[PDB]
Amino acid sequence: ADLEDNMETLNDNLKVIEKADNAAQVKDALTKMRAAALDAQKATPPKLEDKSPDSPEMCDFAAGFAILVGQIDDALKLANEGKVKEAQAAAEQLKTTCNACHQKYR
Ligand code: HEM
Ligand SMILES: CC(=O)Nc1cc2cccnc2c2ncccc12
């Protein structure tokens, strides 16, 4: 998909996880998020469209999602051990990485 749809997915599923009743729900959402994270990792954001893929800015962008995925995976790992609560805790922490990048590039 494209970037906006990716960020929708990311946002919706983050709400789901806040809302989640069991571990399968959370595993599911996190899995959806992972997919979008990775898709988005190769999109070129509007604000950066005039910069070469080489640039500090574009690399930083892509690094964002590298961090984002890693954190998702830590949460995935937690939801896999059935630890719904600690896993929602980890999703909350995502919000940091969202904002940090939104600050720079949204
Ligand atoms: C899981 C955490 C994240 C959530 C919940 C999230 C959600 C959102 C939302 C709701 C929007 C509104 C824009 C729209 O829908 O049209 C948006 C836009 C945007 N986000 Fe994220 N995002 C997250 C992480 C990130 C990260 C890590 C980056 C950079 C690495 C990023 C970069 C952007 C950019 C560039 C836009 C603007 C898109 C446009 O101009 O069309 N986001 N995001
Ligand atoms: C941040 C950065 O250095 N990106 C890249 C830098 C690259 C520099 C030379 C050749 N390929 C790349 C490249 N290819 C795929 C994805 C990213 C890159």
Number of structural domains in the chain: 1
* CATH number of the domain within which 15 lies: 1.20.120.10
Provide the domain limits for residue 57: 1-106
For this PDB entry, the determination method is X-ray
Which of 46, 43, 37 lies closest to 14, judged by CA? Answer: 37
> Vertex 12, ends 10 and 18: CA angle to 5°?
100
Q: Report residues whose beta carbon is within 6 angstroms of any ligand 1 atom.
A: 3-4, 7-8, 10-11, 14, 45-46, 61, 64-65, 68, 94, 97-98, 101-102, 105-106
Contact 43, 82 (CB under 8 A): no
- For this entry, resolution in Å reads 3.1
CA 13 to chain centroid? 10
CB atoms within 10 A of CB 73: 14
